[PDB]
Structures are given as C-alpha cells and as structure tokens.
50S ribosomal protein L15 (Acinetobacter baumannii), 48 residues
Amino acid sequence: TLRLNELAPAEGAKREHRRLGRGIGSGVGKTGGRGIKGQKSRKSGGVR
RNA sequence: GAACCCACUGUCGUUGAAAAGCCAGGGGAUGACUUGUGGAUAGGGGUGAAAGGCUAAUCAAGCCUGGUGAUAGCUGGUUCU
C-alpha cells in the first residue's frame, strides 16, 4: 500500500475507447457501424 | 523530264528499322516556286487561300507553380479474440 505500483482507479472509472475497422472479431470491423452506402456512410456525411 | 518540294493508289509493318516508315507506281518542277541565317506576333490571346487547322510527339481554350488536401447525395477499401 502507498506505492507507485500499488495504486488503482475505482471500478467503473475507466473504459476502453472504441476502435473501428480492426477485424471481424471486434464486432465493428469493415464498415465500422456506418452501414452500407448512402450519404451518411461517406466522410462528413451528416446533413445540416 | 532529273535534282529539290509534295503525298493520289496498292503491298509490307502494327510488342515496327520507324510513337507515322519502306517498296512499286503518282503530282509540281521560272513560280501564288523551294530554301539557309537572324528577327516580330502569347492563351479567351496570337496566326489561319478556313480543316476548329497550328501554337515544342499536348489544343472546342498551351505548359509550370500556387488557391489545394477544390467539391463528388458516386465506385472501391477499412487490419486481433
């Protein structure tokens, strides 16, 4: 206790960030949640 | 009718000897003729016995750099459990 290698954050404080397009297993591979084709699939695809 | 200047027909070549030629024929050949050297005309401009022809193998608007990473409701791609 009270060491630099014995200090931990609270449970639920930190979450891993989501990474798109890094394989089938991740679940967000390939299209990365954008769907298939259309305006919203393109870069900067949101309408005003 | 030779040299010189052209390019009407046919064969060959089409990763060619050649990014436009060779061979056999063909036209002008004292003229509105051919040609060397050095100059002038610059891009919406130049030049054109006029084909949108030519302006460095590039022309219904040359080339280079910059605005610039232009925009693209389109096509493609998007990586471990």
